[PDB]
């Protein structure tokens, strides 16, 4: 059953500095879709294929893995109607962690 | 201005295995609130204060940092009304990455 929602949505600068110092750091991707509220979502492109060991060099005996978690968003449906909507759940990389491979040939 | 939403929301087992092999792994916290759609959100408690170097031991010269990203959720408001709602944006740890400290006394 449909229902009402009031669209009135209800220090950041420091977390980027910690994430930039990660050993499996990432950049941002402008995942934008207009028939979608929120209009713009920023996701994580991992910056390396490996992780960054003590030298400051990439270590390909490790993996940067992007962390994917589903989140809630709205799609205008009928695909053109600015009124009617649906709650949708979509998958978005939210950052990267470093994982050890299992296989070593 | 308020609007309508149809609440019809629109392999997982393998990503946990990669995350369990992270060097800054995490557990799940049942962040539940009934006057909140979604009812239950699972967040990341980092499993260590350091990261897990080659031995399989914790390395306290590093930090497990939980990655925090805001997500969209609904709050029943008036706080009891099952009809009226608001779109809210809340902060939730979505996983952990390993970061190098800056200070070394």
């Amino acid at each position, epitope marked *: 059953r449909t229902v009402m929602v009031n669209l009135n949505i209800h220090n950041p600068k420091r977390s980027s500095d910690y994430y930039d110092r990660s050993t499996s750091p990432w950049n941002l991707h402008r995942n934008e879709d207009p028939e979608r509220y929120p209009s713009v979502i920023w*996701e994580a*492109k991992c*910056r390396h*294929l490996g992780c960054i060991n003590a030298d400051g060099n990439v270590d390909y005996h490790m993996n940067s893995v*992007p962390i994917q978690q589903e989140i809630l968003v709205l799609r205008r449906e009928p695909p053109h109607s600015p009124n009617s909507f649906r709650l949708e759940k979509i998958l978005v990389s939210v950052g990267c962690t470093c*994982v050890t*491979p299992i296989v070593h040939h | 201005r308020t609007v309508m939403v149809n609440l019809n929301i629109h392999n997982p087992k*393998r990503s946990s295995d990669y995350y369990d092999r992270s060097t800054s792994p995490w557990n799940l916290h049942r962040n539940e609130d009934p006057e909140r759609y979604p009812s239950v959100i699972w967040e990341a408690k980092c499993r260590h204060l350091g990261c897990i170097n080659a031995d399989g031991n914790v390395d306290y010269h590093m930090n497990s940092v939980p990655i925090q990203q805001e997500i969209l959720v609904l709050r029943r408001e008036p706080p009891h009304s099952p009809n009226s709602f608001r779109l809210e944006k809340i902060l939730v740890s979505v996983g952990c990455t390993c970061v190098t400290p800056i200070v070394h006394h």
Partner: nanobody
Amino acid sequence: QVQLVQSGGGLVQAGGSLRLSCAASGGTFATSPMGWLRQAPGKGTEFVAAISPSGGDRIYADSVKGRFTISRDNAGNFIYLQMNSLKPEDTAVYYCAVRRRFDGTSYYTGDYDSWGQGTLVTVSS
């Protein structure tokens, strides 16, 4: 999640260059590690190159190192492979793949999923 379309490639004499292209139809792969594999018939599936989600980190097989380059857009809609100074060793069916798993190093083909039929690149003696 997406379909992988490939263009470029054909028949070339040694020392020459092809430039293969691979596109994301029905979805993007912006945040996905990408790569290229190759297989000549009867033989196993070789690694060729892999590219960072951001496009900033690139690895190459020890057979193509210094000849081949991998790159990509930022839209998540294209990855490219450029093959210079071609040798008949290089004769194979090429596949762009997405890195779907993480069971090995970035170099480990078994972590990449090709979608379609390949791209034939024949290099002449």
